[PDB]
Design a protein around this ligand. Structure first.
Ligand code: SF4
Ligand code: SF4
Ligand SMILES: [Zn+2]
Lengths: 113, 360, 176, 114, 96, 208, 95, 126, 43, 48
């Protein structure tokens, strides 16, 4: 359709969103490959990004992809995919699947006091 | 003439409202919310009464829900007149400032007739409203609201198509969609930048689900989009007021749980239980169960939320007031980067900044 | 349910372009503003002539506090201290003792009008309608201590304004 | 007993930061006196700075003196720019305050305050 | 409303809209300042039978918050809520 | 039950409990408690050492998208050893959700600043210092924002009195406004209004 | 009717008169002491005693909702007339 | 390691901003409040309270209110346990005294003893 | 009973849409009038 | 009273030239109205 404006300021119109989304999802998969499999974050994020890769691969149209991905405009999907890739890099660096660092005191979350 | 750093200093009106709430009961803390935003006086109590009723696990009667929306929407006409006209006063066009003040004086009589005060009504209370509308009040609302559509077109004529107003407005105060969300912005800030977000449509409260209206959103995120969104919100307020006047249901104005809302004066002088409950409610106050909640409404400035914490007694443990203008002033350094020193009187203008709720 | 304000694409034809050029050169919208100002010059102004004219007010109006009396000469207040307990500004100070005939009456009823926020909690918490937020509003004083009312000033205010406070409460009490 | 430090790992780093803050305050005091057209001399202001620094000197917790260093640095930064008035600078000199009784006899004469 | 016809004509020409049909000054069309006394209705619990407070105890129905996890299989990844529907354009005035 | 009691929501309770379980099982390093209130509000009590990652997760996950920051509230409870309760409120626009993240912190130990997650907190926690003394490390510009410049102490702490320790009055001898010890014309009358009877049986603490 | 203490200062209905050695009377010189000339006990002292024929009477102050809450007075004791606690009116049984 | 072993005394008296006159001449009192004898309720006797001694309050020369000069007269704090209140008292440098929790002793009640055959605990009337 | 109620037929319709008059002479005609005034003054 | 004028200006008062011994030929006051007329002036009720 070659949408003139995406409706949001600072968000330029992506002329080729299909290859961009596919390369972002594959990059997310390669980044998530290094996470150990027993972490639930790897399983959950791999599942949702594989579902998103399947739905973005099985349809050529852009308007139906926007209306059935439930992510708003396809540029918003690209932005949230980039943010999820940044999250995957940060969780690679941070390793949050380890056990609890410190137990709280017994009277810490007791309300009312 | 140009700007790279603009650091505002606040605290000139710091009264410490949210500490004084801790030493007063829930009913005694109700007039405090009137004086936080003194141009949205009747909208802040709707946020506080929704917080107490959520903790108390009660709901207002159906007649009380329509009154709060009707007088909430008349306060949007209160606030947005202060928004545009003082923004025009700061820029320099003083002519429509006095035109709308006669209209704002006319809706001050509506506040005085139902509650008794022009500004600080203390009308909306947890459990309903304090008093009913006087007889023939809604007849006077309709005859005023019929003629109010000309005044918005009167105000729009001298400002929208004016080339002098446009040249001060069309390219100063531009945000993007992503940085507006990260800056805690709400209200016209998100709507002006093109983000579709309105609390009355997504997370509705008392009877806003039933009514039908439109949410005007911007195209470029400049000050001119934020001026047009404020003028169009006057039109949608008239649309709600016309709907509310024809769909006011019968019933009581207060919740019939007399342990929360006080009983009537005729029944407190005849029944024993009504006199006991009148004694404890006006001296001790009702016991709010422990639990922390964050209830946010759509104020005309933005998202107004109250974080209320109850310790089990009749007094709040902690009552944080979230100001829509507090986060809006936090972005002022980024707002005026690269603009001229005379543009800050318009960048302050396009955000509904009132120094009562900013400094608490 | 959402409308695009300021998303009207201007016409690119010769007619609209020439009309916009004529608007820019001939100041046509400025002429419209001049015409609106001329039309709003000739209207009758809404200026009421104070103090010879007064603004419209309601019988529920909250103003100067006053202490009422029964229609037998006895003071209405029974020193129950509900108004000083409900007062959000703590402007009301009550000190009481049993008087000569054994009736429970006040000895000191002080209202700090510089402290009071005129919220009307005392006029609704009072079980005998003793204290009333009366209709008076023209009581500005030249000295700070003249706004610190004792029991005698409030009783004088009640005796002065009872002839209209009784009518107002008679017209209003069915809403309470 | 193991805690997370703020800026200083031990007492020596906190002492060094105390030294640096005192050096900056001693640099600023003549400029502060001249800027606000103060009635005090330079040495009186430096004596006041020393008197605060020695009044707040009986605490040995590194985190406590680190927080006090941070608060003193905020005070120094607020005096760097023209953010305070003459009143906020002159508040440290309790001049209009009447001198309270200190010995037991005068405190007995004036009231019940111990 | 008491303005003369030539002043009304000049005013209507200068404004471009009919100003007498919608006057901003209030007149005798307003409601009167005195009203007949009203009789308010009662609430839904103004009853003499089956009106026990335990059947409508709103305050006492509160519960402590349910501890989902405390520190003393292949389920799908779950969002806090279903995603929001796309807003539809206003058919009354889309402003396009 | 029907007319005068607020109706209860159960599908929102189920969805919030499911997302709380998902969050608690996706970040086991820092989460300590997850609770869903009776009025369908989700609260996550996490360790202070995970103030940065967890919120960053909620900023950037595909299934959370908590883009907006609503509140940054400090609650002072003197009966605990970590007397300060720092509470973040997050709003997700895509899924239309609200979440609450709670952490504990005493007077001396600092907490890492959340400026890089949400820039609005760049002001908010600043006010927290000006009201509580909770130091926020790596803050860009942390100073007082609401109180007076010569103000000593933090007002919102529960041991701080209602009226302050100093009052301002103008003196003609020094031609200046000056601070004096507080002497009220009338003492603030403390009203004992706590009921001696139990109000809610479901909220009863077990005996010692 | 008010009284007159011999310092020249009027007497309030409570009974508050500044002494001869009280300096606070300097706040009155050049001005006036505002008192109430209608004493409540003297105004109710001239009210007649209502004679009824019932053992239990009910008083609400007159006007219904504009008076004090309704209170029941027992008139069994013929020695003392039953006086209402709110309005101060007193009722007497004929028997 | 990012952790430092500090065994120093937990004292924050210089951080609270209190003047010295109100941290050395005041007596903090930690106690369980007594039950009001006109009521049978005991819900107010479940939490420890911290209070300060009453200072001088005089009469206003103008109009007669209770004018005070003590800023901590309306400062009463609530604590769940005794040791936490003791820690909070030691933390702010207040000299403090503690009164123990006066629990009521378990009485022995019997309805039949009002109608005993020979004991002195008979009821004279009912 | 008696309370503040809308009339049994409801209130009348209330206008809320934007309504601006829009008025003009054409630019070509205005420039022709200016040219005519110029030539008359010059003559 | 003049009911043809717009609301606010329809009722008005001309003050006396002497009230309680004060020569008030020019000095008019807003509190110079007895309560029975203070009802009618400020539009408490329609009945004088
Ligand atoms: S109106 Fe309100 S603030 Fe004023 S005295 Fe009455 S209760 Fe107090
Ligand atoms: S509420 Fe009324 S009766 Fe009670 S003390 Fe106050 S004025 Fe007197
Ligand atoms: Zn009586």
């Amino acid at each position: 359709l070659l949408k003139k404006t995406t409706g949001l300021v600072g968000l330029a119109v992506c002329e080729t969103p299909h290859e961009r989304l596919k390369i972002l999802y594959t990059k997310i998969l390669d980044v998530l490959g290094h996470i150990p499999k027993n972490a639930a974050y790897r399983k959950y994020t791999e599942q949702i990004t594989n579902e998103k890769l399947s739905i973005v691969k099985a349809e050529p149209d852009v308007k139906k992809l926007e209306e059935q991905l439930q992510g708003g405009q396809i540029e918003e999907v690209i932005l949230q995919a980039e943010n999820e890739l940044s999250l995957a890099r940060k969780m690679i660096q941070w390793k949050p699947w380890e056990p609890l660092v410190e137990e709280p005191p017994a009277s810490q979350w007791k309300w009312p006091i | 003439e140009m700007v790279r750093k603009c650091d505002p200093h606040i605290g000139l009106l710091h009264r410490g409202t949210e500490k004084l709430i801790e030493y007063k009961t829930y009913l005694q803390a109700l007039p405090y919310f009137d004086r936080l935003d003194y141009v949205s006086m009747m909208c802040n109590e709707q946020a506080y009464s929704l917080a107490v009723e959520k903790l108390l696990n009660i709901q207002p009667p159906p007649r009380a829900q329509w009154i709060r929306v009707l007088f909430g929407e008349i306060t949007r006409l209160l606030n947005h007149i202060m928004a545009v006209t003082t923004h025009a006063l700061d820029i320099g066009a003083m002519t429509p400032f006095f035109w709308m003040f006669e209209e704002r004086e006319k809706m001050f009589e509506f506040y005085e007739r139902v509650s008794g005060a022009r500004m600080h009504a203390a009308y909306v209370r947890p459990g309903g409203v304090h008093q009913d509308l006087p007889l023939g009040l809604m007849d006077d609302i309709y005859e005023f609201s019929k003629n109010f559509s000309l005044r918005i077109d009167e105000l729009e004529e001298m400002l929208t198509n004016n080339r002098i107003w446009r040249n001060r407005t069309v390219d100063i105060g531009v945000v993007t969609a992503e940085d507006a969300l990260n800056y805690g912005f709400s209200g016209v800030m998100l709507r002006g930048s093109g983000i579709q977000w309105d609390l009355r449509k997504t997370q509705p409260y008392d009877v806003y689900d039933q009514v039908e209206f439109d949410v005007p959103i911007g195209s470029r995120g400049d000050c001119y989009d934020r001026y047009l969104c404020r003028v169009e919100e006057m039109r949608q307020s008239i649309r709600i007021i016309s709907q509310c006047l024809n769909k006011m249901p019968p019933g009581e104005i207060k919740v019939d749980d007399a342990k929360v809302s006080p009983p009537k004066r005729a029944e407190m002088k005849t029944s024993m239980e009504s006199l006991i409950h009148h004694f404890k409610l006006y001296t001790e106050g009702y016991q709010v169960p422990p639990g922390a909640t964050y209830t946010a409404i759509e104020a005309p400035k933005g998202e107004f939320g109250v974080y209320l914490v109850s310790d089990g007694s009749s007094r709040p443990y902690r009552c944080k007031i979230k100001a829509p203008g507090f986060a809006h002033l936090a972005g002022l350094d980024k707002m005026s980067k690269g603009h001229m020193l005379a543009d800050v009187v318009a960048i302050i203008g396009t955000q509904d900044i009132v120094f009562g709720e900013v400094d608490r | 349910t959402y409308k695009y304000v300021n998303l009207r694409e201007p016409s690119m034809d010769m007619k609209s372009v020439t009309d916009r050029a004529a608007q820019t050169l001939l100041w046509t919208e400025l002429i419209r503003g001049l015409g609106m100002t001329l039309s709003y010059l000739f209207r009758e102004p809404a200026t009421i002539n104070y103090p010879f004219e007064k603004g419209p007010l309601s019988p529920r109006f909250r103003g100067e506090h006053a202490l009422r009396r029964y229609p037998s000469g006895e003071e209405r207040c029974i020193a129950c201290k509900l108004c000083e307990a409900v007062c959000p500004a703590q402007a009301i100070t009550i000190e009481a003792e049993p008087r000569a005939d054994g009736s429970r009456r006040t000895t000191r009823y002080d209202i700090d009008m510089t402290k009071c926020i005129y919220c009307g909690f005392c006029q609704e918490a009072c079980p005998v309608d003793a204290i009333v937020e009366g209709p008076n509003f023209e009581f500005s004083t030249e000295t700070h201590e003249e706004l610190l009312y004792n029991k005698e000033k409030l009783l004088n205010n009640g005796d002065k304004w009872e002839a209209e406070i009784a009518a107002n409460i008679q017209a209003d009490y069915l809403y309470r | 007993t193991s805690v997370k430090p703020i800026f200083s790992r031990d007492m020596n780093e906190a002492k060094r930061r105390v030294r640096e803050l005192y050096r900056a305050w001693y640099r600023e005091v003549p400029n502060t006196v001249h800027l606000f057209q103060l009635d005090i001399s330079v040495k009186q202001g430096r004596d006041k700075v020393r008197e605060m620094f020695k009044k707040n000197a009986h605490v040995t917790d590194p985190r406590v003196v680190d927080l006090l260093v941070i608060k003193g640095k905020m005070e120094l930064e607020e005096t760097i720019n023209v953010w305070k008035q003459r009143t906020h600078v002159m508040r440290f000199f309790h001049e209009t305050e009447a001198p309270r009784p200190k010995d037991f006899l005068s405190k007995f004469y004036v009231g019940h305050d111990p | 409303a008491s303005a003369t016809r030539l002043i009304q004509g000049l005013r209507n020409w200068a404004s471009g809209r009919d100003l007498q049909a919608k006057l901003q000054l209030r007149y005798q069309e307003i409601s009167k300042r005195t009203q007949p006394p009203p009789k308010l209705p009662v609430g839904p619990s103004h009853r003499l039978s089956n009106n026990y407070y335990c059947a409508r105890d709103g305050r006492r129905e509160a519960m402590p918050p349910s501890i989902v996890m405390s520190s003393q299989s292949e389920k799908k990844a779950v969002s806090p809520a279903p995603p929001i529907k796309r807003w539809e354009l206003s058919q009354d005035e889309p402003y396009l | 039950t029907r007319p005068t009691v607020r109706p209860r929501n159960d599908v929102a309770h189920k969805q919030l409990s499911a997302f709380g379980e998902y969050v608690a099982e996706i970040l086991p390093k820092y989460v300590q408690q997850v609770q869903v209130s009776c009025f369908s509000e989700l609260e996550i009590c996490i360790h202070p050492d995970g103030v940065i990652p967890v919120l960053t997760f909620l900023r950037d996950h595909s299934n959370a998208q908590f883009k907006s920051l609503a509140d940054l509230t400090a609650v002072d409870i003197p009966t605990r050893q970590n007397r300060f309760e720092i509470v973040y409120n997050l709003l997700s626009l895509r899924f239309n959700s609200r979440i609450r993240v709670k952490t504990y912190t005493d007077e001396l130990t600092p907490v890492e600043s959340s400026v890089s997650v949400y820039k609005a907190a760049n002001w908010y926690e600043r006010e927290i210092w000006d009201m509580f003394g909770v130091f926020f490390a790596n803050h860009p510009d942390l100073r007082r924002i609401l109180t007076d410049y010569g103000f000593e102490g933090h007002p919102f702490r529960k041991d701080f009195p209602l009226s302050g320790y100093v009052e301002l009055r103008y003196d003609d001898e020094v031609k200046r406004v000056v601070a004096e010890p507080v002497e009220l014309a009338q003492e603030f009358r403390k009203f004992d209004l706590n009921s001696p009877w139990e109000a809610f049986p479901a909220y009863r603490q077990p005996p010692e | 009717g008010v009284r007159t203490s011999p310092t020249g200062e009027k007497v309030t209905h409570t009974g508050q008169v500044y002494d001869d050695e009280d300096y606070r009377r300097v706040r009155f010189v050049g001005r006036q002491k505002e008192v109430n000339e209608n004493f409540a006990i003297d105004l109710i002292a001239e009210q007649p005693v209502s004679q009824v024929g019932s053992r239990v009477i009910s008083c609400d102050g007159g006007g219904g909702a504009l008076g004090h809450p309704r209170v029941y007075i027992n008139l069994d004791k013929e020695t003392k007339t039953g006086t209402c606690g709110y309005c101060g009116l007193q009722f007497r049984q004929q028997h | 390691t990012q952790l430092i072993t500090v065994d120093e005394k937990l004292d924050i008296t210089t951080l609270t901003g209190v003047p010295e006159e109100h941290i050395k001449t005041r007596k903090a009192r930690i106690f369980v409040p007594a039950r009001n004898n006109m009521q049978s309720g005991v819900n107010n006797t479940k939490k420890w309270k911290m209070e300060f001694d009453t200072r001088e309050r005089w009469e206003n020369p103008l109009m007669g209110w209770a004018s005070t000069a003590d800023p901590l007269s309306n400062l009463v704090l609530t604590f769940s346990t005794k040791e936490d209140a003791i820690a909070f008292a030691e933390k702010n440098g207040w000299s403090y005294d503690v009164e123990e929790r006066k629990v009521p002793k378990p009485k022995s009640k019997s309805y039949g003893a009002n109608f005993s055959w020979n004991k002195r605990t008979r009821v004279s009337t009912k | 009973v008696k309370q503040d109620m809308p009339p049994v037929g409801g209130y009348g319709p209330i206008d809320y849409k934007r309504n601006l008059p829009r008025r003009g002479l054409s630019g070509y005609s205005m420039f022709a009038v200016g040219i005519g005034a110029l030539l008359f003054g010059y003559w | 009273e003049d009911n043809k004028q717009f609301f606010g200006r329809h009722r008005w008062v001309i003050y006396t030239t002497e009230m309680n011994g004060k020569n008030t030929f020019w000095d008019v006051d807003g509190s110079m109205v007895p309560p029975e007329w203070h009802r009618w002036l400020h539009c408490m009720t329609d009945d004088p």
